[PDB]
Design an enzyme around this catalytic site. Structure first.
Site, mmCIF file in Angstrom:
data_model
loop_
_atom_site.group_PDB
_atom_site.id
_atom_site.type_symbol
_atom_site.label_atom_id
_atom_site.label_comp_id
_atom_site.label_asym_id
_atom_site.label_seq_id
_atom_site.Cartn_x
_atom_site.Cartn_y
_atom_site.Cartn_z
ATOM 1 N N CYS B 152 42.858 40.738 40.877
ATOM 2 C CA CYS B 152 42.994 39.731 41.989
ATOM 3 C C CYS B 152 44.069 40.041 43.233
ATOM 4 O O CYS B 152 43.972 39.477 43.708
ATOM 5 C CB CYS B 152 43.524 38.550 41.055
ATOM 6 N N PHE B 203 36.086 31.893 38.262
ATOM 7 C CA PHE B 203 36.463 33.195 39.046
ATOM 8 C C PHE B 203 34.537 33.082 39.818
ATOM 9 O O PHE B 203 33.700 31.856 38.919
ATOM 10 C CB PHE B 203 36.101 34.138 37.802
ATOM 11 N N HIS B 295 46.723 33.468 47.228
ATOM 12 C CA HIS B 295 45.594 33.952 46.451
ATOM 13 C C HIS B 295 45.581 32.311 45.552
ATOM 14 O O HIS B 295 46.272 32.333 44.764
ATOM 15 C CB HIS B 295 46.222 35.190 44.814
ATOM 16 N N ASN B 328 38.285 30.914 42.676
ATOM 17 C CA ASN B 328 38.838 32.663 42.783
ATOM 18 C C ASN B 328 37.781 33.646 42.876
ATOM 19 O O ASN B 328 37.252 33.516 41.663
ATOM 20 C CB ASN B 328 39.041 32.360 41.235
#
Lengths: 378, 379
Positions: B152, B203, B295, B328
């Site tokens: 990530c 995700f 992020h 994400n």
């Protein structure tokens, strides 16, 4: 001026030596392929002309027996291959790095960057983190982890370190490449003849460098990196494929790699040689350069030597590495950089680079990709 | 304040199929034949409900999964089919994002000198960097850096990498791409793997690309300058995020409070870039005087950094906008946020590309626990 400079080199291999003359016996024994006499005979011929006297391997009869998946041709085996590679790759790198760091002679807190290359396994956090930890480097060392790169990555990590060192005042870059054939070792098969080649040539090894600009009075420059390039060669699509599977890492060789490099090597060298012309106002013959070449195997070395009309001594540092350790993928060319320096001491050369001023560093990998760096000796 | 690596374009791409987060658990527990696991599904629905995600985009769907039952099991062998999908689809998604970036940039693609590619979704030789060079038809002598199995933080890593490429090589123009597909991580839920539920909730797929270069010409259009870059391992965080690539695919383990660890250390991380700002501007902004390109690991990280630093609620909004619309997407995500920062700057009539503010922080997070920090300057 202010060029990225190699300040130390260190190398490491697994302790256990496999003599190349007898490796077919071992290989076909552990893979229970003894019944394949014609295939074994082919393999022995390949080993006999490999230009390799021995290789070092973490893998031995005990481990291979304890994990019969790896002794199959294409059975499930990736998980044990990973268990081995994820653990051993950083360990072997620490050994090389501690030798680099000693040579350098500075405290390891002065290391600001780490570039780690490998083709042998992958994990998160990477081998770069494991090495930071094993060496007790500062937690804010800036890392670049290059996974699954192949045989060109020794050159690739030098290219990467060059911009780190040159763009960052004070930067001291630890470069490490480390490979362990745990992920590629497999039973020989009449249906995978190109696979015999890797089986004969690939060995284990790790190599490390310290690279920095503006060496201090107490540092000792070995080589300068002046020019760096990468390119995909024409008509070379699919030459080397490497697929990471449930059976581990499988290679496929579909074109004449030695011939393709040979065909293009003058073209590749043209720009670094322009750059020399810019600085020295002269144009050396290829044989007036020293050579730090990835020892992919004997054929590449012979055909580039022939094509470029090199005195037979020029490939000697490369062939020395090939002879003693075989093809350790990305670490190999850094072993050759070390050997280049070692012979300059033993054969009383006027420079670190076979007594010459300028040198060519070459790495080769899937693409077909060539990495080219122009070196200056000290 | 001259010669700093500069973002000149951003482009993004996602697979076309949308999965509403509200009903994701129905779909998920159904394709994995886990309907009998009713308490587990309840837990997952709860996790999805508080995730801050409205939808994700996926390459995977019922048809592909049903054609590959290995992928619908918890730990069944399946790496081969997962790789078949990832190795193909990751560079394709990257190509779409990269075309958009090159379009915005406005320059011929022959002027691209470097390519940095980041992914956590599959590995191959030659790499996705080669594939993307070929798909775009760049020069064969473009200089590539292929970053595999990164996680990530790699949206920020490729930006740190590109900064030095651009700044040490005059006239260098760097194509940066991150691309992620969940084919390698998708698997059946299990009471034995409760931390797997986080990844299953959060995700998504997506790719993003930049063009980065130093000394923009008058026909180029700067978005952000990259003034400072650091990477650090956080203390007492050993083992917080593990990711193993196995025969059953990529498996993730979460053994520590990642939002707590980040929050506990965030002010320290920022000390050095804020010293840079003091050196240049002689005054000290508050954290909430910076713009934020973070992020979107999940809602908890954003909430806790916001609180720790006393950020005005609007500072995290571009980040939260991306979490809401895309989830994400691992490495790519922070570059979507960078895009969204610029986009809201146009639509909200801001004085700068960075929410009307001068200086900005870019943050990526990943295994280690590693944190990438970059100081940005808006345009």
């Amino acid at each position: 001026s202010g060029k990225a400079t190699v300040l130390a080199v260190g190398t490491a291999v697994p302790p256990k030596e496999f003599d190349q003359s007898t490796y077919p016996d071992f290989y076909f024994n552990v893979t229970n392929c003894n019944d394949k006499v014609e295939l074994k005979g082919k393999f022995q011929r390949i080993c006999d002309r490999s230009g390799i006297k021995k290789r070092h391997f973490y893998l031995d009869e005990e481990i291979l027996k304890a994990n019969p998946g790896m002794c199959t041709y294409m059975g499930a085996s990736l998980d044990v291959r990973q268990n081995i590679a994820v653990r051993e790759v950083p360990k072997l790198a620490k050994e090389a790095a501690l030798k680099a760091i000693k040579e350098w002679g500075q405290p390891k807190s002065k290391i600001t960057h780490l570039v780690f290359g490998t083709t042998s396994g992958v994990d998160m956090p990477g081998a770069d983190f494991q090495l930071l930890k094993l060496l007790g480097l500062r937690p804010n060392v800036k890392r670049i982890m290059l996974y699954q790169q192949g045989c060109s990555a020794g050159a690739t990590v030098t290219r990467v370190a060059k911009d780190l060192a040159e763009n960052n005042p004070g930067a001291r870059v630890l470069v490490a490449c480390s490979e362990v054939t745990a992920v590629t070792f497999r039973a020989p098969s009449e249906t995978h003849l190109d696979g015999l080649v890797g089986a004969a040539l690939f060995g284990d090894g790790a190599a490390a460098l310290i690279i920095g600009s503006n060496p201090t009075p107490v540092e000792k420059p070995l080589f300068e990196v002046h020019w760096s390039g990468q390119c995909v060669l024409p008509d070379s699509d699919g030459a080397i494929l490497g697929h990471l599977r449930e059976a581990g890492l499988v290679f496929h060789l579909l074109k004449d790699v030695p011939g393709i490099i040979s065909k293009n090597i003058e073209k590749l060298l043209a720009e670094p040689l322009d750059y020399v012309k810019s600085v020295d106002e002269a144009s050396p013959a290829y044989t007036d350069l020293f050579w730090v070449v990835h020892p992919g195997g004997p054929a590449i070395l012979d055909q580039v030597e022939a094509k470029l009309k090199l005195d037979k001594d020029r490939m000697q540092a490369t062939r020395d590495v090939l002879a003693q350790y075989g093809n350790m993928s990305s670490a190999s060319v850094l072993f050759v950089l070390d050997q280049m320096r070692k012979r300059s001491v033993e054969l009383n050369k006027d420079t670190t680079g076979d007594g010459l001023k300028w040198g060519v560093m070459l790495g080769f990998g899937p693409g077909l990709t060539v990495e080219t760096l122009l070196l200056k000796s000290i």
